[PDB]
Design an enzyme around this catalytic site. Structure first.
Site, PDB file in Angstrom:
ATOM      1  N   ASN B  39       0.828  -1.216   0.000  1.00 22.85           N
ATOM      2  CA  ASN B  39       0.000   0.000   0.000  1.00 22.85           C
ATOM      3  C   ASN B  39       0.860   1.263   0.000  1.00 22.85           C
ATOM      4  O   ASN B  39       1.763   1.383   0.839  1.00 22.85           O
ATOM      5  CB  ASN B  39      -0.902  -0.017   1.236  1.00 22.85           C
ATOM      6  CG  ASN B  39      -1.956   1.071   1.216  1.00 22.85           C
ATOM      7  OD1 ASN B  39      -2.434   1.452   0.146  1.00 22.85           O
ATOM      8  ND2 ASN B  39      -2.345   1.563   2.395  1.00 22.85           N
ATOM      9  N   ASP B 104       5.182  -5.220   2.791  1.00 19.64           N
ATOM     10  CA  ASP B 104       3.969  -4.594   3.384  1.00 19.64           C
ATOM     11  C   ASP B 104       2.783  -5.553   3.228  1.00 19.64           C
ATOM     12  O   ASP B 104       2.883  -6.716   3.643  1.00 19.64           O
ATOM     13  CB  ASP B 104       3.781  -3.209   2.774  1.00 19.64           C
ATOM     14  CG  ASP B 104       2.571  -2.472   3.343  1.00 19.64           C
ATOM     15  OD1 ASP B 104       2.628  -2.047   4.517  1.00 19.64           O
ATOM     16  OD2 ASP B 104       1.560  -2.314   2.617  1.00 19.64           O
ATOM     17  N   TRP B 105       1.649  -5.128   2.658  1.00 20.07           N
ATOM     18  CA  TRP B 105       0.522  -6.061   2.562  1.00 20.07           C
ATOM     19  C   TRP B 105       0.771  -7.177   1.555  1.00 20.07           C
ATOM     20  O   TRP B 105       0.142  -8.240   1.661  1.00 20.07           O
ATOM     21  CB  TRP B 105      -0.775  -5.303   2.252  1.00 20.07           C
ATOM     22  CG  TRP B 105      -1.318  -4.743   3.528  1.00 20.07           C
ATOM     23  CD1 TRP B 105      -1.172  -3.465   3.992  1.00 20.07           C
ATOM     24  CD2 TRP B 105      -2.030  -5.461   4.547  1.00 20.07           C
ATOM     25  NE1 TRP B 105      -1.762  -3.340   5.225  1.00 20.07           N
ATOM     26  CE2 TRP B 105      -2.295  -4.549   5.590  1.00 20.07           C
ATOM     27  CE3 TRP B 105      -2.459  -6.788   4.679  1.00 20.07           C
ATOM     28  CZ2 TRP B 105      -2.985  -4.914   6.743  1.00 20.07           C
ATOM     29  CZ3 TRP B 105      -3.150  -7.152   5.835  1.00 20.07           C
ATOM     30  CH2 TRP B 105      -3.401  -6.219   6.848  1.00 20.07           C
ATOM     31  N   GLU B 128      10.276  -4.923   5.290  1.00 20.98           N
ATOM     32  CA  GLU B 128       9.278  -3.985   5.808  1.00 20.98           C
ATOM     33  C   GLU B 128       7.884  -4.619   5.756  1.00 20.98           C
ATOM     34  O   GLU B 128       6.963  -4.143   5.090  1.00 20.98           O
ATOM     35  CB  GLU B 128       9.350  -2.669   5.037  1.00 20.98           C
ATOM     36  CG  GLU B 128      10.361  -1.687   5.655  1.00 20.98           C
ATOM     37  CD  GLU B 128       9.878  -1.131   6.994  1.00 20.98           C
ATOM     38  OE1 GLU B 128       8.761  -0.577   7.056  1.00 20.98           O
ATOM     39  OE2 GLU B 128      10.633  -1.237   7.999  1.00 20.98           O
ATOM     40  N   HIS B 270       7.919  19.516  12.801  1.00 20.87           N
ATOM     41  CA  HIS B 270       8.766  20.229  13.753  1.00 20.87           C
ATOM     42  C   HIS B 270       8.945  21.700  13.410  1.00 20.87           C
ATOM     43  O   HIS B 270       8.798  22.554  14.289  1.00 20.87           O
ATOM     44  CB  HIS B 270      10.143  19.554  13.866  1.00 20.87           C
ATOM     45  CG  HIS B 270      11.039  20.216  14.868  1.00 20.87           C
ATOM     46  ND1 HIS B 270      10.759  20.224  16.214  1.00 20.87           N
ATOM     47  CD2 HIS B 270      12.180  20.933  14.714  1.00 20.87           C
ATOM     48  CE1 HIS B 270      11.707  20.888  16.858  1.00 20.87           C
ATOM     49  NE2 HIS B 270      12.585  21.324  15.970  1.00 20.87           N
TER      50      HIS B 270
END
Lengths: 290, 297
Positions: B39, B104-105, B128, B270
């Site tokens: 994704n 991922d997926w 990942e 930030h």
């Protein structure tokens, strides 16, 4: 947002060096002292000062070693910055001040204020330094952000209506800069919001803290299988990572059979966009020849 | 340097009534390598990896249903939907044994398929990837990981001094909107020589964390204690998601500090000044007049 720096330079001698500063606005009244942090300079304040300078004097120094200020032979510890900023303030003859402070500029400003409370008439601040008692309390902005993504109200508005995963998460989680051509390839399947349902469904189903229970059960099941399996395994990991912190890569090297690990260097989530040549050639080497 | 084109002929296969797109390159008559994206990507994510594998192996990279160049049927698009279409894709190509390369997926799909079909998986390369994440207190962790690295002997200097990580990485990454090249060049000027970056490395090594360094801990604890008892007028700007002050912390400060007003600036990480300078400046200008003390008598 303006990119120019239309401020006349001013310099003052401080502890044998010169410090550069912005000084604009009326000469009488209480001045407003703007303090930047790491790794910025008075340039950070360039689009804020014009709102204030019509009514109040604005003073914005470049900290020693930064901006246009001198680069003396220092370790540049906080105590060095305290000495130079203390001397800067006295050299300008400032009496009472309002502080506008950020990051290490906030540590300098709050420390000066605590030592000189009768001279501080107001403090505006943001994204400031506070004591973090344990490493576990170091702020992780992505905790609330990812929880928000998973909600059906705020998360759907972000991911479906605002296309936040294409326009935000995808480029932010590649360390190197994605190009416009690459972005347009990634944008093409999702030009209409009505096409973006899968983009929200995926994060909503990530197994985190036991939820959702159905995905948790099946992902736990295949991780138990992976721990049991002799199948050849090859794990690529980067630093700092996102889904797989380095500590998790290390845990997996202790627990998975027949595992090779390859560190790819800097990496967030889309590691293929940061080091494709190492990933592809190491896959090729790992596969048996014919 | 990293290629931007997608120089693969489209292939399409009918799957459960829809058409799915896939890359198919490399020699036949061997064990194929099946690349599964996640994704919000597609086979495009593998475009610069496949050319290293294709000289010796067949490479197959589908676009998941509803993604890439694949069709967009009316589904809920839950995990079960992706399982059904990928399962049927694999059978529609007549694949027997495979090597999986997953992310991922695509890794949830690949590991779930592998567990159900273990005799058909000859190897798994992954990155990942999806595993059960125990708690939100332990994860995400990458802000801790970065700042621990800055404070790690040798590692931190290599990042901040050699690679200029604070100027080229932290600064633009922690502004929501994109900094321009003109802006980046202004920020780069004082640090073009590596040796000039010493202050940038020393700053994170001074952050007060778990009592260390002890001198900074003591003075930051002292000024925070002072701030909590002082009636000085205070104005806190905060953004979402923030970095050092996430919204949950802004809310807690709104309750605990005396004489504090808060201003939400919208999206911000930030360097909030780079995301909404006009609201910060205009709100400061609106706040300053009430800070005037009448002449005492």
């Amino acid at each position: 947002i303006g990119t120019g720096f239309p401020f006349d330079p001013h310099y003052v001698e401080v502890l044998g060096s010169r410090m550069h500063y912005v000084d604009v606005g009326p000469r009488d009244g209480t001045p407003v002292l703007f303090l930047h942090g790491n790794p910025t300079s008075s340039y950070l304040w360039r689009n804020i000062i014009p709102h204030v300078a019509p009514s109040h004097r604005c003073i914005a120094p470049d900290l020693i070693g930064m901006g246009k200020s001198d680069k003396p032979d220092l370790d540049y510890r906080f105590d060095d910055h305290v000495r130079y900023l203390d001397a800067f303030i006295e050299a300008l003859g400032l009496e009472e001040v309002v502080l506008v402070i950020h990051d290490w500029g906030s540590a300098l400003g709050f420390h000066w204020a605590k030592r000189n409370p009768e001279r501080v008439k107001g403090i505006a601040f943001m994204e400031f330094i506070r004591p973090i008692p344990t490493w576990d309390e170091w702020p992780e902005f992505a905790r609330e952000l990812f929880q928000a993504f998973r909600t059906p109200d705020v998360g759907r508005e972000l991911i479906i209506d605002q296309n936040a995963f294409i326009e935000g998460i995808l480029p932010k989680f590649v360390v190197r800069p994605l190009t416009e051509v690459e972005m347009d390839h990634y944008r093409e399947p999702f030009l209409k919001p009505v096409w973006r349902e899968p983009l929200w469904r995926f994060p909503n189903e990530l197994p985190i803290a036991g939820e959702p229970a159905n995905i948790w059960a099946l992902v736990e099941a295949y991780m138990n299988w992976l721990h049991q399996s002799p199948v050849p395994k090859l794990l690529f990991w980067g630093t700092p990572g996102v889904l797989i912190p380095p500590a998790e890569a290390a845990r997996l090297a202790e627990s998975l059979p027949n595992l090779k690990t390859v560190f790819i260097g800097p990496g967030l989530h889309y590691l293929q966009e940061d080091n494709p040549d190492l990933i592809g050639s190491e896959i090729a080497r790992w596969l048996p020849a014919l």
